[PDB]
Amino acid sequence: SEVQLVESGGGLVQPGGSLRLSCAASGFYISYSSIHWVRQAPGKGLEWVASISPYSGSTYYADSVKGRFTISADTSKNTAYLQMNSLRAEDTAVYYCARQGYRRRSGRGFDYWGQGTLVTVSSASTKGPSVFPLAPSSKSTSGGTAALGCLVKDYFPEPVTVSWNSGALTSGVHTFPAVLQSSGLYSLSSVVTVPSSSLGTQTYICNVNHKPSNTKVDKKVEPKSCD
Amino acid sequence: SDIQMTQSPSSLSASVGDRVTITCRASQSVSSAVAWYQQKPGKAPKLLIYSASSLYSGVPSRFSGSRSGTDFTLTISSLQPEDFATYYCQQSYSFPSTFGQGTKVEIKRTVAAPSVFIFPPSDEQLKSGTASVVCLLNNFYPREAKVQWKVDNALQSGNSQESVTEQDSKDSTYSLSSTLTLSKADYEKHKVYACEVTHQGLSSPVTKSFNRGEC
RNA sequence: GGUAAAACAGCCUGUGGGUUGAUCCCACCCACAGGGCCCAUUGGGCGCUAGCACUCUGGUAUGAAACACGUACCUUUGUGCGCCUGUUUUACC
Secondary structure: OOOEEEEEOOEEEOOOOOEEEEEEEEOOOHHHOOEEEEEEOOOOOEEEEEEEOOOOOOEEEOOOOOOOEEEEEEOOOOEEEEEEOOOOHHHOEEEEEEEEOOHHHHOOOEEEEOOOEEEEEOOOOOEOOEEEEEOOOOOOEEOOEEEEEEEEEEEEOOOOEEEEHHHOEOOOEEEOOOEEOOOOOEEEEEEEEEEHHHOOOOOEEEEEEEHHHOEEEEEEEOOOOOO | OOOOEEEEOOEEEEOOOOOEEEEEEEOOOOOOOEEEEEEOOOOOOEEEEEOOOEEOOOOOOOEEEEEEOOEEEEEEOOOOHHHOOEEEEEEOOOOOOEEOOOEEEEEOOOOEOOEEEEEOOOHHHHHOOEEEEEEEEEEEEOOOOEEEEEEOOEEOOOOEEEEEOOOOOOOOOEEEEEEEEEEHHHHOOOOEEEEEEEOOOOOOOEEEEEEOOOO
16 A cells, blocks of 8 residues: 555663654655554553644643653654653553544544554563474374474563474464563464374474574474484 | 443454444443454554444445444454454544453354373473473364463462464464473472363363473 | 503412501512522523524534634523513603
8 A cells, every 4th residue: 555654663671761663654644634653562452642633733642651752743754753751561562653544534533554663661681582492202192293392482572483494384383472471581482283203204493583682593303312 | 531432342252154243332422433443463453434333445344333322333244254353442532542442353163172292391491490391282172271280290380371372264273382480400309290281172181291301 | 541761570389478558459578498401510590482792611514624723503601782571660642
């Protein structure tokens, strides 16, 4: 589509720190529209954050961010902004920019949304994962089906990607949502179920990429040597 | 006083072709300034309905919205596979705006018992002083499942975390991983590590276990 | 009897008592008792399909537009004008 919103400026920030998000519009001019910010904590619902009205520049805020966040818009740059101060852990979320559409066409509905940008508020420092194998066994079978995987432990912040055999292996793969551990670091597993008879001849490699730390790990997952 | 939008149900299981109705009840007048959105995992929301009952351009006619006073409904007359998603209402009658809590619409199918697998910690991880024991519940339905960890037949509590995949696009099942975390010193105190799984598709709980250090 | 003018009273309904005329007798007043409808409610207002103006309270629609701005409206508060009834007057017939 020609109409696009692109959020940028997300990333890691310490509690009490500040971040400015940007929302760059393409295919339309924001000066004829209201622009809104909406956020979504991991696994939770949409939460409206702030908005700015055309021609007046009037601004509105959710009670949850009142006094800490400031929304603004630059007509010449065709870009909206969200200045966020005094950030707390509970502000961790994907932040979306959204266009309120044209009144005659879609009322007050928000007709275009950006892809969103992740903001993580934590005292933890960026850290790449340790990748450990989840080895298969012949004693651990569901019929003629074995399971194996990779445990992707102690990384920060989100996200990580996992593929198998450089994307050649997709069937039967389950890569689980990360959990935030009490240490403040994330962990996830990625598994695949394969034929038991394949275990001796077929090779399995999980490819783990953690862009925030510029970390890439390839881990071969093999049956234990005694097996 | 901020306007509340109380959305129900929080989750719905329906078969392809079923009619579903999602309700959003405002705590004050919002006139007809209510919008409905669809959102799929990892994706931005998409507008469906604006002004409580108007279909947004390009949205299929099987979606409809209605207002009765301060109660609002979204109806899908016949679910198609691409319609299984989360749905949100929104009031934009006054500031601050309010989204409803969401309704996740998931695919109903026949019961499927999980395939269960238990993974000892790797020797590599152990060298660093921590043991992660992983239990996999593969391709089951419905989502509700109970995992219990036992260590030499002692029930564990508080030292495990789990997560669940989104419903599989091909077979409509779920999978679940549970991770039990121990210090290496604590791990070496015990022999039998067991994952006990309860699920509607199992007539009695299934236990998968290993003896620490066995092949 | 009527005509005209400036006033006074009227949310709705009682129950007493007074007023001031000998009695009477309504009008006014007073007290009390209720019963509605509305508003911006520690309180305030309501004679009116006879409404109008401005002003506020809260709203609608629209201009690429929730506020602000422009346009066209609705509503409420207050004020003034108008109107109805009842009664008392003054000028006139």
